[PDB]
Amino acid sequence: SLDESFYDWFERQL
Amino acid sequence: QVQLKESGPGLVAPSQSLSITCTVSGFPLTAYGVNWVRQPPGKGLEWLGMIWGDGNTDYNSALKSRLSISKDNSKSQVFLKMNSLQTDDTARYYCARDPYGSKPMDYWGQGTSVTV
Amino acid sequence: DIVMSQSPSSLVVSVGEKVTMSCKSSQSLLYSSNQKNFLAWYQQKPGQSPKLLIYWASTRESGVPDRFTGSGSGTDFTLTISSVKAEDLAVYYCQQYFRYRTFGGGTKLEIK
Amino acid sequence: GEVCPGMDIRNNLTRLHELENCSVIEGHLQILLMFKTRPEDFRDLSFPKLIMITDYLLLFRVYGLESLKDLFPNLTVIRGSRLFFNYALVIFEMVHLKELGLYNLMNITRGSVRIEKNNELCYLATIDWSRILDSVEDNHIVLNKDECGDICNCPATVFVERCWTHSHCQKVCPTICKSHGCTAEGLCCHSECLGNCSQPDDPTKCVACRNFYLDGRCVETCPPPYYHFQDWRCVNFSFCQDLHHKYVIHNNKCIPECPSGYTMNSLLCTP
Ligand SMILES: *[C@@H]1O[C@H](CO[C@@H]2O[C@@H](C)[C@@H](O)[C@@H](O)[C@@H]2O)[C@@H](O[C@@H]2O[C@H](CO)[C@@H](O[C@@H]3O[C@H](CO[C@H]4O[C@H](CO)[C@@H](O)[C@H](O)[C@@H]4O)[C@@H](O)[C@H](O[C@H]4O[C@H](CO)[C@@H](O)[C@H](O)[C@@H]4O[C@@H]4O[C@H](CO)[C@@H](O)[C@H](O)[C@H]4NC(C)=O)[C@@H]3O)[C@H](O)[C@H]2NC(C)=O)[C@H](O)[C@H]1NC(C)=O
Ligand SMILES: *[C@@H]1O[C@H](CO[C@@H]2O[C@@H](C)[C@@H](O)[C@@H](O)[C@@H]2O)[C@@H](O[C@@H]2O[C@H](CO)[C@@H](O)[C@H](O)[C@H]2NC(C)=O)[C@H](O)[C@H]1NC(C)=O
Ligand SMILES: *[C@@H]1O[C@H](CO)[C@@H](O[C@@H]2O[C@H](CO)[C@@H](O)[C@H](O)[C@H]2NC(C)=O)[C@H](O)[C@H]1NC(C)=O
Ligand SMILES: *[C@@H]1O[C@H](CO)[C@@H](O)[C@H](O)[C@H]1NC(C)=O
Ligand SMILES: *[C@@H]1O[C@H](CO)[C@@H](O)[C@H](O)[C@H]1NC(C)=O
């Protein structure tokens, strides 16, 4: 998913 | 508002050089190209060369050996110099604004009548 | 170097008639990057400097009458005057501006 | 002004001052994860020289930042050549952000806008994105503060008045100007301009270009012997060559690598 892809990038940053 | 004007010597002795100054106004020579075109009396147009905004030049492959184009951005001037003129170099010499990435030569000067 | 070949060299026409003239380039003037043709048409009236008519082969310069239409692509180009006016007597030149510039031989517009 | 590469600014405001002379960011700009910052750190912090970003702008978890009106007052175009998953502008979990305030943003050339989960964020309903993007259909603007009391003289579009802040309207030009922009008196910028200009009908007075930039002028295409670079500027062979000798030429473009089916003649891609 795009929203998955999206949110997961911000998560990788934490 | 956009203007170009040639200052030529009128007469050149055979084997002598031709020097012409094109004085421009209403636009910056840093952003526009300026070409030189000549027209023998009642004959066609012959493209001679051009000087880009960055000062790089392109010369007519047939007359490459005889021509030099230089300029002074701060004095809004473009200079043509041509080696050893002969009778067949008799022509009207024009300088014209070349907006390179948009339109071909738009604004022309009234040319300078040059007689060998 | 690119050779620009214009036809006819000269023609005589009356006011009101349609005129078509040709300009053929030795190599394609079609720029891959914008799919436009690097060709212009100029009009040179007697005792005057050339005036730009058309650029990109078909784009009319500001102030140029709608009666002038440029067409063609690649190597073969045409300038049409839908209804010639008395003021149109001139020599018409094409020019390539792809790499350096080159002019045709000019077609001469005589009016009787 | 200067052309800067893309930047990723996190943790501290220190590296942010690397933007001090940029007119154009040739890349993206990410500002994120600043937990120690407070409003006072932003009060006198401004980058008025920044006009354009070629890729995208992303802001995430930047504490103490309440508006972007002082940070990027003159940012006019985001080109979206590269995107953050299809977005050219991303504002996410900006905990103190009260308004965007990008009052000079006129065009987003490619991509969409994602503005999400900004408790405090107002002045979103007052922006008409259809004036900035061709398609707003893929915008994702949800879960923000937006009763807001968005108080804006301002233009109205479908009808609602449009503004970025209490003191800044959204600029709207006559329809004949299209995307080119206009002066305060409503006179169209040149057709090669994008968004705004200092003077009407002059391609050397554009704030940004619709197509390409060359020698202080906005041009429709890069003419030979120049090459299209980063989909916004014209460069010469020597420049492309200098990049290569720590890039190739293909279809009048200076690009990172030869496409499929091509290899590099030692700088032109040949099949
Ligand atoms: C292919 O492209 C390259 C690169 O183009 C670049 O990108 C474009 C998109 C655009 O932004 C363009 O401006 C860029 O240049 C071309 O190379 C470039 O050529 C120009 C010359 O035409 C060079 O300019 C000269 O640079 C030196 C050094 O720069 C200083 O500033 C840098 C800032 O980052 C520092 O890093 C440097 O260390 C350095 O300190 C300047 O000194 C020169 O200035 C003088 O000339 C200009 C006019 O050309 C005047 O405006 C100035 O006031 C200077 O005047 C001189 O003053 C002294 C003292 O008073 C006097 O004695 C001299 O006689 C004066 N000279 C003149 C001529 O008046 C220049 O600005 C670029 O540096 C160079 N860039 C690169 C990266 O190579 C390249 O030409 C082109 N290739 C081909 C095939 O043509
Ligand atoms: C932002 O610009 C200033 C001014 O210099 C400019 O940038 C140079 C690289 C060059 O392009 C000049 O022609 C420009 O005018 C920079 O400040 C200068 O920094 C140097 C040391 O690096 C120092 O010797 C100078 O005196 C400084 N000048 C002033 C007025 O403070 C500044 O560093 C640039 N910032 C960045 C991130 O590049
Ligand atoms: C934003 O500016 C662009 C710049 O031209 C406008 O046009 C789009 O630009 C791209 C690339 O130049 C084209 O491929 C599109 O097809 C263009 N669309 C249109 C409708 O021309 C764009 O319209 C501007 N948008 C706004 C809302 O300002
Ligand atoms: C952060 O900011 C300080 C100044 O407060 C600076 O000196 C230091 O180099 C920076 N450190 C990091 C880890 O970014
Ligand atoms: C455009 O730019 C000028 C300065 O060049 C600025 O003062 C003005 O507010 C801007 N106008 C628009 C249309 O955003």
XYZ file of C-alpha atoms and ligand atoms in Angstrom:
692
model
C 0.000 0.000 0.000
C 0.971 3.680 -0.581
C -0.185 4.707 2.994
C 1.753 1.684 4.360
C 4.805 2.661 2.206
C 4.259 6.291 3.440
C 3.880 5.703 7.227
C 6.622 2.998 7.213
C 9.192 5.544 5.880
C 8.492 7.852 8.882
C 8.666 4.787 11.185
C 12.144 3.756 9.659
C 13.186 7.233 10.928
C 12.488 6.133 14.602
C 12.485 49.598 -27.058
C 14.724 46.701 -28.434
C 17.314 48.271 -30.805
C 20.429 47.204 -32.708
C 22.578 49.458 -34.838
C 25.683 48.757 -36.938
C 28.616 51.228 -37.245
C 30.658 50.222 -40.293
C 33.432 51.979 -42.268
C 31.525 52.273 -45.554
C 34.664 51.687 -47.659
C 37.386 48.972 -47.435
C 40.410 48.686 -49.769
C 40.849 45.188 -51.328
C 42.939 42.955 -48.989
C 42.158 45.107 -45.918
C 40.041 44.034 -42.927
C 36.443 44.995 -42.047
C 35.509 46.058 -38.478
C 31.865 46.694 -37.445
C 30.372 47.520 -34.097
C 26.794 46.583 -33.305
C 25.480 48.709 -30.415
C 22.347 47.306 -28.805
C 19.763 48.552 -26.282
C 16.635 47.342 -24.556
C 17.836 43.853 -23.671
C 20.980 42.350 -22.089
C 23.688 40.790 -24.316
C 24.199 38.298 -21.429
C 20.763 36.715 -22.164
C 20.557 37.023 -25.984
C 22.520 35.945 -28.995
C 23.590 38.291 -31.791
C 24.230 37.149 -35.358
C 25.774 38.774 -38.404
C 24.187 38.371 -41.756
C 25.240 39.949 -45.002
C 23.443 40.626 -48.264
C 25.359 41.341 -51.503
C 23.445 44.006 -53.499
C 20.195 42.428 -54.738
C 21.239 38.985 -53.640
C 20.235 36.692 -50.812
C 21.091 36.416 -47.170
C 24.298 34.822 -46.062
C 24.632 33.933 -42.427
C 28.116 34.780 -41.178
C 28.171 33.766 -37.518
C 26.758 34.467 -34.020
C 27.775 35.118 -30.448
C 25.772 33.433 -27.660
C 24.969 34.996 -24.289
C 27.899 33.133 -22.750
C 30.310 34.584 -25.390
C 30.774 31.239 -27.233
C 30.714 31.690 -31.040
C 29.651 29.837 -34.152
C 30.999 30.775 -37.587
C 29.852 29.951 -41.127
C 31.855 26.844 -42.147
C 32.487 28.319 -45.616
C 33.958 31.653 -44.271
C 35.161 30.291 -40.870
C 38.756 31.272 -41.593
C 37.912 34.948 -42.198
C 35.713 35.865 -39.300
C 35.944 36.971 -35.610
C 32.995 37.872 -33.301
C 33.609 39.351 -29.838
C 31.559 41.551 -27.500
C 31.485 43.725 -24.422
C 28.411 42.998 -22.302
C 28.832 46.125 -20.111
C 28.987 48.443 -23.157
C 26.126 46.640 -24.966
C 28.387 46.171 -27.997
C 29.072 43.231 -30.379
C 32.125 43.303 -32.671
C 32.610 41.738 -36.088
C 36.039 41.624 -37.751
C 36.671 40.057 -41.209
C 40.071 39.464 -42.846
C 41.150 40.543 -46.402
C 38.011 41.753 -48.115
C 37.678 41.432 -51.854
C 35.125 42.987 -54.219
C 32.702 40.068 -53.677
C 32.495 40.938 -49.936
C 30.614 44.107 -50.961
C 27.319 43.762 -49.090
C 25.033 45.174 -46.438
C 26.099 43.721 -43.057
C 23.399 43.288 -40.362
C 23.544 42.373 -36.670
C 20.311 40.681 -35.291
C 19.032 39.495 -31.896
C 18.837 35.718 -31.536
C 16.599 34.692 -28.566
C 18.193 31.153 -28.715
C 15.693 28.952 -26.778
C 12.560 30.664 -28.096
C 12.371 32.451 -31.472
C 15.043 32.708 -34.257
C 16.575 36.159 -34.996
C 13.842 38.688 -34.316
C 15.083 42.330 -34.042
C 17.419 43.448 -36.872
C 19.569 46.581 -37.328
C 19.279 48.576 -40.570
C 22.611 47.109 -41.636
C 25.788 48.788 -42.685
C 26.410 49.277 -46.358
C 29.995 48.175 -46.927
C 31.763 48.789 -50.289
C 35.121 47.217 -51.374
C 26.254 21.919 -43.112
C 22.505 22.229 -43.741
C 21.447 23.336 -47.242
C 18.153 25.259 -47.503
C 16.530 24.930 -50.985
C 13.665 27.341 -51.808
C 11.137 27.069 -54.760
C 10.154 28.979 -56.884
C 12.992 31.499 -57.170
C 10.453 34.049 -58.442
C 6.713 34.337 -59.158
C 4.217 37.013 -60.367
C 0.718 37.087 -58.788
C -2.309 39.412 -58.586
C -3.790 40.966 -55.396
C -6.268 38.495 -53.849
C -4.734 35.293 -55.183
C -3.352 32.533 -52.966
C 0.417 31.910 -53.042
C 2.314 28.790 -51.893
C 6.086 28.512 -51.691
C 8.454 25.729 -50.658
C 11.594 25.350 -48.505
C 13.433 21.998 -48.402
C 16.238 21.302 -45.890
C 19.054 18.777 -46.591
C 18.574 17.261 -43.133
C 15.610 17.042 -40.747
C 15.029 20.105 -38.598
C 12.765 18.179 -36.191
C 14.023 18.475 -32.615
C 13.368 15.244 -30.761
C 13.105 17.026 -27.333
C 10.063 19.175 -28.142
C 8.834 17.632 -31.453
C 9.080 21.085 -33.096
C 10.748 22.033 -36.338
C 13.633 24.560 -36.020
C 12.495 26.636 -39.028
C 11.567 30.269 -39.515
C 10.219 32.383 -42.364
C 11.184 36.022 -42.946
C 9.808 38.680 -45.220
C 12.142 41.280 -46.696
C 10.346 44.242 -48.261
C 12.269 46.435 -50.763
C 14.774 48.689 -49.001
C 13.975 47.187 -45.608
C 15.517 44.731 -43.171
C 14.041 41.210 -42.926
C 11.045 40.757 -40.604
C 10.246 37.558 -38.800
C 6.960 35.960 -39.894
C 6.908 32.401 -38.583
C 8.991 30.331 -36.192
C 8.811 26.680 -35.099
C 7.685 26.178 -38.782
C 4.031 27.144 -37.946
C 3.994 29.674 -35.045
C 3.081 33.155 -36.200
C 5.155 36.045 -34.739
C 3.188 38.723 -32.853
C 1.825 41.337 -35.279
C 1.923 39.027 -38.309
C -1.372 38.749 -40.273
C -3.335 35.453 -40.095
C -3.125 35.222 -43.946
C 0.427 33.881 -43.505
C 0.551 30.184 -42.587
C 3.621 28.039 -42.224
C 3.399 24.258 -42.461
C 5.508 21.102 -42.930
C 7.811 18.901 -40.831
C 11.239 17.293 -41.003
C 12.724 18.432 -44.335
C 9.837 19.822 -46.437
C 8.237 23.152 -45.508
C 5.609 25.502 -47.026
C 4.634 29.165 -46.588
C 1.123 30.002 -47.789
C -0.466 33.487 -48.177
C -4.248 32.886 -48.239
C -5.107 36.136 -50.101
C -2.164 38.306 -51.171
C -2.261 42.037 -50.361
C -0.455 44.827 -52.265
C 1.903 45.343 -49.343
C 3.130 41.739 -49.492
C 5.594 42.358 -52.349
C 8.872 41.132 -50.865
C 11.433 38.390 -50.923
C 10.600 35.522 -48.567
C 13.408 33.578 -46.903
C 13.374 30.443 -44.820
C 16.063 29.864 -42.201
C 17.080 26.854 -40.171
C 18.155 27.516 -36.569
C 18.680 23.932 -35.295
C 22.544 24.183 -35.319
C 23.901 27.543 -36.614
C 21.745 29.343 -39.261
C 21.238 28.871 -43.008
C 18.979 30.778 -45.437
C 17.300 29.642 -48.661
C 17.583 31.432 -52.026
C 14.397 33.388 -51.430
C 11.250 33.383 -53.458
C 10.528 36.751 -55.108
C 6.911 38.025 -54.810
C 6.099 40.262 -57.815
C 2.587 41.803 -58.088
C 0.822 42.733 -61.393
C 21.347 33.221 -6.648
C 23.068 29.805 -6.031
C 21.827 26.301 -7.027
C 22.091 23.913 -4.087
C 21.796 20.152 -3.996
C 19.031 18.299 -2.122
C 19.248 18.389 1.683
C 18.093 16.257 4.606
C 18.048 18.402 7.737
C 17.394 16.693 11.042
C 18.017 16.849 14.816
C 19.557 20.404 15.022
C 18.971 23.649 13.148
C 22.774 23.955 12.508
C 22.842 22.487 8.962
C 19.828 24.574 7.957
C 22.063 27.615 7.390
C 23.539 25.730 4.426
C 20.435 27.079 2.556
C 21.449 30.683 3.228
C 22.449 31.491 -0.424
C 20.156 29.092 -2.417
C 17.713 30.406 -4.953
C 17.039 26.884 -6.264
C 17.308 23.508 -4.563
C 18.179 21.002 -7.270
C 16.831 18.004 -5.357
C 14.442 17.723 -2.395
C 14.316 19.396 0.977
C 13.478 17.331 4.076
C 13.327 18.998 7.510
C 12.539 16.565 10.279
C 12.897 15.278 13.804
C 13.771 18.422 15.740
C 12.548 17.817 19.240
C 14.564 20.498 21.103
C 13.542 23.495 18.921
C 11.120 26.158 20.263
C 9.334 29.159 18.598
C 12.133 31.536 19.627
C 14.566 29.487 17.463
C 12.443 30.340 14.366
C 11.429 33.998 15.133
C 14.403 35.474 13.244
C 15.105 32.551 10.871
C 14.399 33.213 7.225
C 15.495 32.036 3.756
C 14.061 34.720 1.468
C 16.316 33.725 -1.409
C 14.654 30.315 -1.939
C 12.367 30.488 -4.969
C 12.203 26.903 -6.129
C 12.639 23.202 -5.263
C 12.970 20.798 -8.246
C 11.759 17.675 -6.386
C 9.707 17.831 -3.176
C 9.431 19.570 0.222
C 8.882 17.379 3.301
C 8.389 18.540 6.911
C 7.936 16.021 9.733
C 7.996 16.385 13.588
C 9.690 19.836 13.733
C 8.938 21.265 17.201
C 8.326 24.940 17.860
C 7.660 25.805 14.146
C 4.290 27.563 13.902
C 4.334 28.819 10.314
C 6.513 28.643 7.232
C 5.772 32.325 6.278
C 9.130 33.532 7.613
C 11.170 30.466 6.711
C 10.202 30.267 3.001
C 8.431 33.544 2.179
C 9.392 33.495 -1.537
C 9.169 29.766 -2.415
C 7.189 29.986 -5.670
C 7.530 26.611 -7.453
C 7.923 22.976 -6.410
C 8.569 21.108 -9.697
C 8.086 17.557 -8.476
C 10.675 15.991 -10.886
C 11.174 13.372 -8.179
C 8.502 12.795 -5.593
C 8.024 11.305 -2.115
C 5.781 8.460 -3.148
C 3.757 10.681 -5.641
C 3.816 13.777 -3.306
C 5.561 17.082 -4.043
C 4.653 18.570 -0.633
C 4.465 16.602 2.643
C 3.524 18.150 6.020
C 3.182 15.395 8.591
C 2.930 15.376 12.410
C 4.056 19.017 12.605
C 2.895 19.317 16.233
C 3.057 23.170 16.569
C 2.293 24.261 12.994
C -0.608 26.715 12.945
C -0.567 27.640 9.231
C 1.482 26.722 6.166
C 2.000 30.370 5.160
C 3.725 29.561 1.846
C 2.144 32.758 0.464
C 4.292 32.841 -2.646
C 3.686 29.197 -3.703
C 2.054 29.495 -7.163
C 2.699 26.191 -8.856
C 3.363 22.524 -8.101
C 4.347 21.249 -11.502
C 4.048 17.522 -10.856
C 2.813 15.421 -7.941
C 0.303 15.858 -5.148
C 0.052 17.333 -1.640
C -0.096 15.265 1.584
C -0.911 17.285 4.735
C -1.845 14.981 7.577
C -2.018 14.781 11.395
C -1.102 18.380 12.198
C -3.056 19.221 15.373
C -2.899 23.026 15.465
C -2.947 23.353 11.636
C -5.350 25.911 10.256
C -5.515 28.035 7.112
C -5.898 24.901 4.910
C -9.583 25.349 3.976
C -8.596 28.856 2.800
C -6.115 27.568 0.186
C -7.430 26.878 -3.332
C -5.071 24.158 -4.463
C -6.710 24.029 -7.960
C -4.786 27.269 -8.697
C -1.497 25.516 -7.745
C -1.903 21.920 -9.091
C -3.581 20.697 -12.306
C -5.087 17.803 -10.342
C -6.134 17.993 -6.681
C -7.827 14.606 -6.969
C -4.796 12.834 -5.433
C -4.255 15.348 -2.588
C -4.510 13.878 0.898
C -5.335 16.573 3.435
C -6.878 15.089 6.577
C -6.688 14.876 10.383
C -5.625 18.524 10.890
C -7.083 21.120 13.292
C -9.161 22.219 10.294
C -13.360 25.137 14.299
C -10.297 27.074 13.118
C -11.488 30.709 12.741
C -9.477 31.219 9.533
C -9.688 35.024 9.213
C -8.443 36.470 5.907
C -9.749 41.989 0.015
C -8.779 38.395 -0.808
C -9.856 36.605 -4.033
C -12.727 34.120 -3.792
C -13.059 30.838 -5.591
C -15.471 27.851 -5.515
C -17.451 30.601 -3.073
C -14.811 31.151 -0.352
C -12.126 33.788 0.178
C -8.558 32.531 -0.149
C -5.605 33.213 2.035
C -2.469 31.687 3.559
C -2.467 33.724 6.837
C -4.372 36.554 8.601
C -2.059 38.963 6.757
C -1.518 37.187 3.365
C -4.009 36.547 0.552
C -3.638 33.787 -2.044
C -2.492 35.433 -5.318
C -4.798 34.849 -8.243
C -4.158 36.191 -11.684
C -6.510 36.873 -14.583
C -7.305 33.714 -16.528
C -5.458 35.019 -19.644
C -2.206 34.801 -17.625
C -2.649 31.033 -17.198
C 0.260 29.731 -15.047
C 2.654 32.549 -15.999
C 1.836 34.870 -13.125
C 1.199 38.608 -13.119
C 2.277 41.839 -11.457
C 0.280 43.517 -8.654
C -1.527 45.581 -11.326
C -2.708 42.358 -13.035
C -0.383 42.494 -16.054
C 0.739 39.120 -17.322
C 4.215 37.840 -16.877
C 5.920 36.555 -20.007
C 4.655 33.182 -21.388
C 7.998 31.567 -20.454
C 7.595 32.644 -16.766
C 6.014 30.456 -14.079
C 4.137 31.849 -11.123
C 5.499 35.376 -10.820
C 7.818 38.063 -12.283
C 9.227 41.460 -11.295
C 8.089 42.986 -14.658
C 5.415 42.063 -17.200
C 6.153 40.417 -20.570
C 9.945 40.063 -19.996
C 11.564 36.572 -19.952
C 14.575 37.869 -18.013
C 12.341 39.140 -15.147
C 10.724 35.808 -14.133
C 10.809 34.575 -10.593
C 10.839 31.039 -12.133
C 10.616 29.417 -15.623
C 7.777 27.432 -17.135
C 10.154 25.362 -19.216
C 13.961 25.786 -18.966
C 16.459 28.299 -17.595
C 19.465 29.603 -19.572
C 21.778 32.589 -19.219
C 19.391 34.642 -16.971
C 16.412 33.944 -19.235
C 13.468 31.586 -19.405
C 13.433 29.522 -22.647
C 11.015 27.064 -24.220
C 13.670 24.474 -25.045
C 17.432 24.233 -24.664
C 18.765 24.836 -28.124
C 21.802 22.952 -29.465
C 24.532 22.829 -28.350
C 23.029 22.921 -24.816
C 21.481 20.003 -23.015
C 18.435 19.694 -20.795
C 19.537 19.068 -17.203
C 17.406 18.026 -14.213
C 14.344 18.929 -16.317
C 14.724 22.736 -15.571
C 18.071 24.103 -16.769
C 20.299 24.182 -19.866
C 23.896 23.149 -19.586
C 26.811 22.788 -22.005
C 28.853 19.682 -22.933
C 31.682 20.663 -20.613
C 29.400 20.767 -17.580
C 28.004 17.302 -18.337
C 31.588 16.144 -18.917
C 32.749 17.548 -15.554
C 29.971 15.675 -13.733
C 30.917 12.440 -15.579
C 34.592 12.758 -14.477
C 33.259 12.654 -10.806
C 26.559 11.389 -16.573
C 25.783 10.787 -20.300
C 24.108 12.495 -23.264
C 20.881 11.093 -24.681
C 18.000 12.792 -26.616
C 19.449 16.309 -25.905
C 19.529 15.594 -22.167
C 22.436 15.249 -19.739
C 21.336 12.220 -17.673
C 22.666 9.920 -14.913
C 22.789 6.784 -17.060
C 22.155 5.328 -20.524
C 18.646 3.949 -20.918
C 17.944 0.263 -21.651
C 19.419 -0.884 -24.977
C 22.130 1.814 -25.024
C 25.772 2.115 -23.992
C 28.111 5.019 -23.823
C 30.389 5.943 -26.735
C 33.329 7.526 -24.858
C 29.574 11.023 -23.850
C 26.835 9.973 -26.225
C 24.499 7.036 -25.649
C 24.461 4.768 -28.760
C 22.263 1.665 -29.233
C 30.417 25.466 -20.022
O 29.806 25.785 -18.780
C 30.747 26.186 -17.779
C 29.966 26.303 -16.491
O 28.855 27.193 -16.563
C 28.321 27.485 -15.287
O 26.939 27.101 -15.126
C 25.949 27.927 -15.778
C 24.607 27.279 -15.532
C 26.059 29.373 -15.285
O 25.700 29.494 -13.907
C 27.474 29.890 -15.557
O 27.663 31.229 -15.091
C 28.544 28.982 -14.952
O 29.834 29.439 -15.350
C 31.478 27.461 -18.208
O 32.466 27.775 -17.237
C 32.424 29.007 -16.557
O 32.956 30.077 -17.349
C 32.958 31.363 -16.700
C 33.523 32.375 -17.681
O 32.651 32.647 -18.778
C 33.767 31.271 -15.410
O 33.641 32.502 -14.725
C 34.785 33.036 -14.118
O 34.978 32.497 -12.795
C 36.082 33.071 -12.067
C 36.210 32.321 -10.753
O 35.008 32.290 -9.968
C 35.086 32.737 -8.620
O 33.873 32.484 -7.877
C 33.590 31.107 -7.523
C 32.249 31.104 -6.809
O 31.796 29.795 -6.466
C 34.734 30.532 -6.684
O 34.515 29.155 -6.374
C 36.058 30.676 -7.427
O 37.119 30.198 -6.604
C 36.314 32.110 -7.911
O 36.760 32.961 -6.857
C 35.877 34.575 -11.894
O 37.030 35.128 -11.266
C 35.617 35.256 -13.240
O 35.228 36.611 -13.031
C 35.690 37.600 -13.929
O 34.988 37.559 -15.184
C 33.583 37.895 -15.177
C 33.123 37.822 -16.617
O 33.446 36.560 -17.197
C 33.343 39.253 -14.508
O 31.950 39.498 -14.344
C 34.027 39.295 -13.140
O 33.794 40.525 -12.458
C 35.517 38.972 -13.258
O 36.224 39.992 -13.979
C 37.658 39.909 -13.967
O 38.197 40.702 -12.896
C 39.635 40.739 -12.816
C 39.981 41.618 -11.631
O 39.226 42.826 -11.615
C 40.211 41.232 -14.146
O 41.636 41.287 -14.112
C 39.729 40.332 -15.285
O 40.293 40.748 -16.528
C 38.198 40.308 -15.346
N 37.741 39.426 -16.414
C 36.682 39.680 -17.222
C 36.449 38.696 -18.331
O 35.947 40.653 -17.059
C 34.540 34.538 -14.055
O 33.218 34.824 -13.598
C 33.223 30.150 -14.532
O 33.981 30.047 -13.330
C 33.240 28.819 -15.280
N 32.626 27.778 -14.466
C 33.108 26.529 -14.321
C 32.491 25.725 -13.218
O 33.997 26.074 -15.036
C 32.234 27.244 -19.520
O 32.636 28.507 -20.055
C 31.364 26.533 -20.554
N 32.169 25.764 -21.489
C 32.316 26.090 -22.789
C 32.654 24.953 -23.711
O 32.171 27.243 -23.200
C 26.869 32.366 1.478
O 27.494 33.474 0.818
C 28.469 34.234 1.563
C 29.096 35.220 0.578
O 30.000 34.652 -0.399
C 29.400 34.064 -1.546
O 29.702 32.660 -1.699
C 31.022 32.322 -2.176
C 31.138 30.815 -2.143
C 31.242 32.941 -3.555
O 30.343 32.399 -4.521
C 31.090 34.456 -3.448
O 31.220 35.033 -4.743
C 29.759 34.872 -2.815
O 29.740 36.271 -2.543
C 29.478 33.314 2.263
O 30.230 34.035 3.242
C 31.640 34.151 3.057
O 32.340 32.993 3.538
C 33.757 33.003 3.267
C 34.317 31.711 3.825
O 33.709 30.572 3.231
C 34.395 34.261 3.861
O 35.769 34.360 3.491
C 33.634 35.505 3.401
O 34.206 36.691 3.947
C 32.154 35.399 3.778
N 31.437 36.606 3.394
C 30.570 37.246 4.193
C 29.996 38.518 3.645
O 30.263 36.818 5.305
C 28.783 32.125 2.927
O 29.752 31.259 3.511
C 27.930 31.357 1.915
N 27.339 30.174 2.528
C 27.428 28.931 2.012
C 26.750 27.847 2.796
O 28.019 28.697 0.962
C 1.744 24.694 -13.208
O 2.703 25.039 -14.221
C 2.759 24.107 -15.318
C 3.883 24.574 -16.227
O 3.542 24.555 -17.618
C 1.386 24.048 -15.987
O 1.302 23.119 -17.082
C 1.537 21.691 -17.002
O 2.955 21.436 -17.166
C 3.442 20.145 -17.626
C 4.912 20.327 -17.969
O 5.247 21.653 -18.395
C 2.601 19.582 -18.778
O 3.003 18.265 -19.176
C 1.127 19.632 -18.382
O 0.308 18.979 -19.352
C 0.726 21.092 -18.156
N -0.713 21.234 -17.982
C -1.447 22.200 -18.593
C -2.916 22.208 -18.274
O -0.946 23.018 -19.368
C 0.285 23.798 -14.966
O -0.972 23.965 -15.590
C 0.346 24.810 -13.822
N -0.705 24.511 -12.863
C -1.249 25.398 -12.032
C -2.543 24.974 -11.401
O -0.720 26.485 -11.792
C 24.280 20.737 16.952
O 24.282 22.109 17.376
C 25.479 22.536 18.052
C 25.245 23.963 18.502
O 24.161 24.041 19.424
C 26.673 22.346 17.114
O 27.862 22.951 17.627
C 26.893 20.852 16.879
O 27.932 20.659 15.921
C 25.600 20.159 16.423
N 25.648 18.729 16.718
C 24.923 17.780 16.074
C 25.066 16.379 16.593
O 24.187 18.045 15.127
C 5.998 38.569 -7.073
O 7.326 39.040 -6.868
C 7.405 40.352 -6.287
C 8.877 40.692 -6.231
O 9.528 40.321 -7.446
C 6.703 40.341 -4.927
O 6.849 41.588 -4.242
C 5.225 40.003 -5.120
O 4.540 39.950 -3.870
C 5.043 38.683 -5.879
N 3.729 38.650 -6.505
C 2.969 37.544 -6.617
C 2.036 37.506 -7.794
O 3.070 36.600 -5.834
